[PDB]
Structure formats: structure tokens, C-alpha cells
């Protein structure tokens, strides 16, 4: 029934979340995934892990085969996808070492395959217009947040708490990402424009991954690791992965493993059926 | 002599604006148009209709061959293009069931062929930089608005009328569209950003259609149908019936607009359309 | 030593010869003119080719930058025509840019990736201040040396703005083209606080940094885009008429800037340019 896929970003190229049971070199109608998929169990919950950028981190954000990654996880029976992403902060209260359970995004990517459906031969037949107002699976979002609570990691909810309750390092219970195409980081001019728009963090990999997960009928939630402030305060590759970030990986692993258990502890029949019905009801050719 | 092409969007996949005299199954130097073009008359005015998404609505917005559609209409001697588009509202006074005769846009599309000219072997030779300050044919916009008046539909001009003149359903006498690439709808984050920029509606099909019409020397005007509020604002059977009624009204507007176009001389406007292309050829002026 | 490449846009020394080169990323826009400014080697490359037949979205920026790198250039000075989005930047002015916002798409914007037509690797370049500051200041000093007014918004104000002037800083929005902006887009860009709009700065500036080169751009204001009156709305004739009046000033600045670069030592700067590339490899 429930099976949890995990897409590991920067810092999660060889996650070792569970003892490896099987290794799947698979293909999809949309090509090869970033790497082999590793299947196993967390407790009694089947789980599948794949590194977004492949082994050795050779695939840049704009060239990841998001379609193949999501479709391959779905083909293996995944009902959920938990994903990590390293990001820069655009706001004073989002400090390096914090995490963010995202609930919103603004898309500035281009040139990436962002839908399974279309009119050309390398796509599924149909025109699919998915609602994306709240683009994540809210139930799965709350499980990431509860998992943090269960692992004694501070949770800061701006809606029900004051700024004095923002004790770092903390998990931010909501937040918006602007997803840029990369590979370059933002200019200071771009960073201030994103901040003035009210965006919380900037990354390169959330879109179209989040969109395709919903197209596939899967429940998707992302946990973003704040690795540095973006250049409005500067961001470098070495800074995006440092001693704080090495500590961040430890706690993100604990959140992910606890989130998988928490997913497995609940019935998802109605949510899964709703995910599938949202796809069929978004077809405008039918 | 004038000849009006009509590109029908959602709700116009198979319109019967007139008894079809002939059909033209053609291709263009830029590929196949979305469907067979249907030829006929409104009164004594020659007319040509093609559905933007093809019959059966199998072609999504980013895959529509805008170049082929415009070129095919130009090849048949069209002097004008009237186009429809179903859109979401970004503003409180643009209510489902209203219409907008667009006069402005912000472009957020990518990955679409948006010009007939370039340095590639299959493009027309030359560098064409068209002015787009006011990107529609203003004379044809005013015909659409007058057609609405002639068909007893309210017209609301916010530049001269108090918001107490905004009586629904109404044709908004001006408005701006943000054209997103699709196929997904916007997030709430994106919707509120577009709203804060002052954009009136969101759609997926205006650009590059409007640009290519001007490149082709054709007078282009768009009438948008507001089908719903975009997701900045938090049953379906009522919305569907409302859209059906909107299609009936837009069909009335198109039929009257064709007659009004035929009732005037367009020699000078057509010549100015063609001169604007020649004066935008940077390679010739250099 | 130093060697300065010049990438000249719309309508834009002792000439020794013309050279055709190939690159791993294709052919440059045109042949390159090799020569000297005093004792400094200099190479001139027309961005849009002879006859201006290549539109901004189709310029092979990777080839142009790599061609100059392969010839041993340490610096690239670039020009571009642009539209002003702000009252105090008027046609005939110049802007030594220091910032940009990118609205381009569909252009090859990096030398590195996982496809066979790119260099193997994942390169995430910092771009907070995307130009070479030393080279920007040389463009400004060159204008001073040629008796062209310099206007600095951080220390002067509109009352002290003498045209035609070189604006000592400024941000560009780079749009993909080939069409000019709508009024709606122009006002949105202006409300974001951008100074000018153009079509060719990106990915040229990004690829220069990827190649370890010092890059600075001087933009020529040819028009007010289309946020003003209808008689002031941009079109090709308007851009070309003003560009022809401003070329000789751009010439004087660029040629003076080449001499000023050659008068200084760039050893540590060049080292830092190269080291920045190496430290940005994530693979
Ligand atoms: N500042 C930043 N911008 C974009 N992606 C990032 N990933 C980590 N830090 C980032
Ligand atoms: N207004 C403008 N927009 C874009 N590119 C330009 N080049 C010159 N003027 C321009």
C-alpha cells in the first residue's frame, strides 16, 4: 500500500538510510533516472532512495531528468516522495542551519521537461492542467514537521508563534521558494528583487519535481536545508556545504527516517484516491 | 478587401460561426497548423476559422504551433486575426463571466518559437525587432468593444467610469494579461505576485500569438473570457454553465466584429501594418 | 601580459589582421580583428556579425567568449545599446553596469554540464557582483580622461547631472528578444528599480566569469524604452539614429580603457579569476 520514495539532493549522494535490499537499474518512457534506485525497508515501510544529481553529483539542476526520476519511483510503487534541497535564505529569520518545510514556490526555471502529457510522441497522450495553488501534499508536510518535533528539533511556526520563539537551529513550518534555473547563483540585484517579492529561500531543483509528483498522483513534500544567506547580505559552493551543513545532514536524516515511520503509521487510502482523481479531473482533452 | 481569421481557444475547439464553404488542409514553412482551416462568410465578409488547440483539444499551450497558425492564415490572405482566450482573474473587479479586450501583456512564456526571422536556415532571413509598446491593433480592439455594445453587453472602462459602472457581466475595455507557460496553473505565491504587479488576468496562449501576428503584418485583437478567479482567491456545475453562456456571448461578439470590420476601409491600416515590419528590419536599416 | 577583447554590439586601432577561429562550442559570430593599442594586444569581435544578421537570442555567446579566451585575452570590454527605464538616463548617456536581472531563456549559458557538447562538470559560479570591479573603474576613469562627465547616483543628485554622462553604476534587465517590451513590461521593470533594458548582456557576462576573464560592460542609452510618450517609444530607427551619434564617444572610452588596463599589473586579479572557477566546481 504505502511506499515512500526519497530524492536526495546536495549532501545526500550516498544517503545510507537503510540496509540495501535491491538495486534497480530502470528505464522510463522519458529516459533514464539520475542513477540506480535503492530499495529497502525503514521498519515495516518499503522505501526507495535515488540521488537527484546522480553518483558523484555530475548532473546540474537544469539537466536532471525530473520526469524519469518521478516516473521511476511511481513505477516501483511509491505513494509518497520526500525530497531534500540545499538553498539560500532571503530573510533574516531563516538562518544557515535552519530547515524549511516548504508550502509555496515561484518558478523561474526554463528549458526543463515539466509535464508528462502532451501532443508529441515522447509524452503521454492528453492535455493536463493541474491545480497548484497549494502545490505540496499538506498531510505529508505536517508529517515532516511532526517528525522534527519527535526528534527534539525546534519548530518555528510564524502563524502561531512570536519571533522570540524562533530559536536556531529550527524547522520553519512554512515557506516559499523561488526556483532559479542555474547553474549560476543569483546577482545581488536578483536576490533583492526576490526578497522584495516576499520569497523566503532560493534553490535550483524544486521545479518541476514538485509539479511532476502531483501529475503522477504522488504525495510530495520537500525539506529545504538553509546552507547560507543568498547574496543580499556571500553564497559559494564550498559555503553551501560546510561544517554547519555537515551537521544539517545528520538532522535531516533523522527527520526523513522518522517521517517514513510516521507515514507508515497512518491510513492513506482516501488521500491516494484523491491524488489519482485530481489527475483525471485535470485532463482537458477528455 | 478584408478577410478575417479567427483563432478559437478553449470553448471554441469546433465552432460553427458560419456554414463552411470549404476546408483547407495545409502546412507552412514552420510546420503544421493546429487543424484544418475552415472557410466561409459572415454576410459578405470572407472568414477563416481554426481551433488553437485542434479539434479534441489535444495540443497544450506550450506546444501550439503559433508560427504555423499565423502563417497559414496569412497565406490565405487574412488581413485580420480575432482570437479568444479563457483566463483566470487576478483582480476583484474582473469576475467570472466578464470579458476583457486586452491591450497589454507581461510575457512569462519560454521554449516557444516566437519569431519568423533569424539566422537559422529555416527562418526568414533578417533580424526583426518589432515595437510592442501597445502590441495589439487598436482599431480592431475598438471594433471588438463596439461589437459588444451592439450585442447589448455591458462595457466598463475604468479610466473614465466609476467602479459603480462595473456592472457584471461586462467587457472590460482594457486590461493586461500575464501569459505563463503552463501546462500547470499558478501557485498562490505566483498568483499574488502577479496581482501585486497590477496584471488583470492570467492565461497561457496570448504570447507569442500576438507577436507573430504583428510580424506577419496582420491586425490582431484578443477577447479574453474570465472563467474563474486565479488562486489568489480561496460549485463546478455553475462555473461550467457560466462558461457556456460566455462562449455564446463571445460568438455573438465575433460575428458582429467581423461584420463591422467588413463595413470599413482598411487600405491605410494594412499598408501601415506592412511598413511596420519593414521598418523593424535591423539588418536592412544597418 | 594583458590582452583585451572587445565585443561590439549594434552598429559597432592599428589593424594587423583578421582571424577565423573554431571553438569546442561552435564558430564565433564572425572573424576577429587583431591589432594593438600602443603595445597592448587587442581583439575586436562584432557580436551580431558583419551585416548584423544574428539576433540576440541566436548569438553564440559560448563561442565568442571561448574564442577570446583561446586567443589569450585576459579582459573583455563589451558594449550594448539599451533602453533607459529611469528619468535621469537619457539617450546619449552611457552606463558602466554593475548589476543585472536575467529574463533570457533558451540560450547556452554555461560551458559545463552533463551533455556531450559541454565540458564535464557542474559549475555554480557566484554572481553577487557579476562584473570585474577593477575593470569597471577603468571604464569610468577612461571617461574622465576623455572629458566625458561621470554621474554617480550614490554621491550626486539630479541637480548635478550633466549630459551626456557616464553613469557610474546601473542595473540591466536582459530580455530575450527579438521584440521590444510592452508598456506593461516596461513599467514593471521600472517599478523593480532596474535602470536599463537590453538583450545581449546575459549570458555574455556569466560566461566571461566562467572563462576566468575580467569583464566589464558599457551600455549606450539609445532610447527611453516605451514608458514615456508615444513619440519616444523605442523602434529600430530610433536606436540606430542615437547609436551613430554616441559611437565615437564609446570608441574613445574603449580605446583609452585598453591603454589603462595595460598600464597596471593584473597577476593577482587573474589568479583570483582562475581560482574562482576552480572553487565553484561542485562535482
Ligand atoms: N543561494 C543559493 N541559491 C540557489 N541555490 C542554492 N543552493 C544553496 N544555496 C543556494
Ligand atoms: N528599449 C530597448 N529594449 C531592448 N533592447 C534595446 N536595445 C536598444 N534599446 C532597447
GROMACS .gro file of C-alpha atoms in nm, chain B residues 2 4 80-82 101 137-151 155 171 173 219-223 252-266 269:
model
   45
  288UNK     CA    1  -1.052   4.228  -4.593
  290UNK     CA    2  -1.083   3.788  -4.106
  366UNK     CA    3  -0.709   4.044  -3.952
  367UNK     CA    4  -0.697   3.787  -3.674
  368UNK     CA    5  -0.956   3.785  -3.395
  387UNK     CA    6  -1.046   4.324  -2.472
  423UNK     CA    7  -0.419   4.662  -3.344
  424UNK     CA    8  -0.608   4.942  -3.168
  425UNK     CA    9  -0.863   4.989  -3.447
  426UNK     CA   10  -0.953   4.619  -3.422
  427UNK     CA   11  -0.969   4.634  -3.040
  428UNK     CA   12  -1.224   4.914  -3.065
  429UNK     CA   13  -1.426   4.702  -3.310
  430UNK     CA   14  -1.447   4.416  -3.057
  431UNK     CA   15  -1.565   4.661  -2.791
  432UNK     CA   16  -1.820   4.821  -3.024
  433UNK     CA   17  -1.939   4.473  -3.123
  434UNK     CA   18  -2.008   4.406  -2.754
  435UNK     CA   19  -2.206   4.732  -2.728
  436UNK     CA   20  -2.402   4.636  -3.039
  437UNK     CA   21  -2.488   4.299  -2.883
  441UNK     CA   22  -1.878   4.775  -2.126
  457UNK     CA   23  -1.646   4.366  -2.125
  459UNK     CA   24  -1.243   4.799  -2.221
  505UNK     CA   25  -0.420   4.330  -3.738
  506UNK     CA   26  -0.470   4.121  -3.421
  507UNK     CA   27  -0.711   4.162  -3.130
  508UNK     CA   28  -0.794   3.927  -2.843
  509UNK     CA   29  -1.109   3.887  -2.636
  538UNK     CA   30  -2.208   3.696  -3.083
  539UNK     CA   31  -1.923   3.946  -3.041
  540UNK     CA   32  -1.704   3.774  -3.303
  541UNK     CA   33  -1.985   3.758  -3.558
  542UNK     CA   34  -2.067   4.126  -3.510
  543UNK     CA   35  -1.699   4.224  -3.513
  544UNK     CA   36  -1.648   4.052  -3.848
  545UNK     CA   37  -1.940   4.247  -3.995
  546UNK     CA   38  -1.805   4.574  -3.851
  547UNK     CA   39  -1.459   4.510  -3.997
  548UNK     CA   40  -1.610   4.450  -4.341
  549UNK     CA   41  -1.803   4.777  -4.319
  550UNK     CA   42  -1.487   4.994  -4.314
  551UNK     CA   43  -1.192   5.057  -4.545
  552UNK     CA   44  -0.861   4.918  -4.419
  555UNK     CA   45  -0.408   5.038  -4.180
   0.00000   0.00000   0.00000
